[PDB]
């Protein structure tokens, strides 16, 4: 889609995790990094790197 509410939701979550960045487990870090992979793939480039 690149343009839907679902996209907006996913990017809002990625923004959320970027702010705190104090993860507490494998799933949280895997989530964030999988969000970044998704963002870079969908919108080509974005401002944040994988941790």
């Amino acid at each position: 889609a690149m343009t839907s509410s679902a996209d907006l939701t996913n990017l809002k979550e990625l923004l959320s995790l970027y702010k705190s960045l104090r993860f507490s487990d494998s799933a949280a870090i895997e989530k964030y990094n999988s969000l970044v992979e998704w963002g870079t793939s969908t919108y080509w480039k974005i401002g944040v790197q994988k941790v």
Binding site: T3, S4, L11, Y18, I46
Partner: peptide, 14 residues
Amino acid sequence: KDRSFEIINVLLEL
């Protein structure tokens, strides 16, 4: 139903 304007703003913030 396109939310490109909200989406842009999140991407900037990132």
